[PDB]
């Protein structure tokens, strides 16, 4: 089996959080990048970390990944976060000024001193 | 069968009190129950209470104010001489400074301090503290 242990996986996640923009989908470029960025004590571990980083970067491009977060994805999901629809879903224009509430709710409405149209 | 209406009344009071209720229903009523409740109310352990006529034994609603720790009957109604009130007070009450043993004397139903003032004794009926 070839399950990658916690050390390589955590190191890959840290690398992607910190240095996502300067990191690509190729193993050789990521190998040199890991060599310059990370102080890895062995070349075998360096290659394993570079390869797993390549795997994660290759997965990300198709869609987000749990655990990982870099300061471009968070900005874009914040921009999507602050979205205010110009027309409101609770604006009563969607039924043309009327409620569809059943008669029991209509008597609730009356009994609170309101005469809003149904 | 029902053997002591006072026992049922005081048990219902305790079970309402421990659950945090502020009111409790009592059935049946009796003169002894009303006198015991009046002794309790005089010392502040219960609020007001209201008797409900039903052309029968009656019902009572009692108001509870959270000061009651326990009330209960002593069954049998043991005969108590004057010099034996002290052992009942030692046995039944939490401390010497508060709480009451409730007696039925030929002078009427009273707490043991009123009994000591009038120098009377009868049968033991209950307690409250």
């Amino acid at each position: 089996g070839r399950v990658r242990t916690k050390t390589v996986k955590r190191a890959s996640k840290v690398l992607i959080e910190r240095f996502y923009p300067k990191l690509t989908l190729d193993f050789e470029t990521n190998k040199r990048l890991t060599s310059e960025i990370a102080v890895i004590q062995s070349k075998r571990l360096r290659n394993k970390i570079a390869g797993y980083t390549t795997h994660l970067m290759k997965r990300i491009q198709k869609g987000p990944v749990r655990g990982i977060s870099f300061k471009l994805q968070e900005e874009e999901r914040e921009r999507k976060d602050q979205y205010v629809p110009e027309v409101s879903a609770l604006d009563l224009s969607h039924t043309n000024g009327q409620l569809e509430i059943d008669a029991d709710t209509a008597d609730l409405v009356k009994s609170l001193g309101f005469k809003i149209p149904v | 069968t029902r053997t002591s209406v006072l026992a049922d009344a005081l048990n219902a009071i305790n079970n309402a009190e421990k659950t945090g209720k502020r009111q409790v229903l009592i059935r049946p009523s009796s003169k002894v129950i009303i006198k015991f409740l009046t002794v309790m109310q005089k010392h502040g352990y219960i609020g007001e209470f209201e008797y409900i006529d039903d052309h029968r034994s009656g019902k009572i609603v009692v108001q509870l104010n959270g000061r009651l720790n326990k009330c209960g009957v002593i069954q049998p109604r043991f005969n108590v001489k004057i010099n034996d009130i002290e052992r009942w007070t030692d046995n039944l009450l939490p401390a010497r400074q508060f709480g009451y043993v409730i007696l039925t004397t030929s002078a009427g139903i009273m707490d043991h301090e009123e009994a000591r003032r009038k120098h009377v004794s009868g049968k033991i009926l209950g307690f409250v503290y």
Binding site: - | Q75, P76, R77, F78
Partner: protein, 48 residues
């Protein structure tokens, strides 16, 4: 409740019930059967 009579006029029942059940107490039963007097090697003395 509690399975013993509580009545004010129940003294005979309580006294006889206690009398019956002390026989299960080995010390009391030995004393009232007179076992030390009739079956002990020393006949109930301290020395022999």
């Amino acid at each position: 409740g509690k399975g013993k009579p509580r009545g004010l006029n129940s003294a005979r029942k309580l006294r006889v019930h206690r009398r019956n059940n002390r026989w299960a107490d080995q010390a009391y039963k030995a004393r009232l059967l007179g076992t030390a007097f009739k079956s002990s090697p020393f006949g109930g003395s301290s020395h022999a």
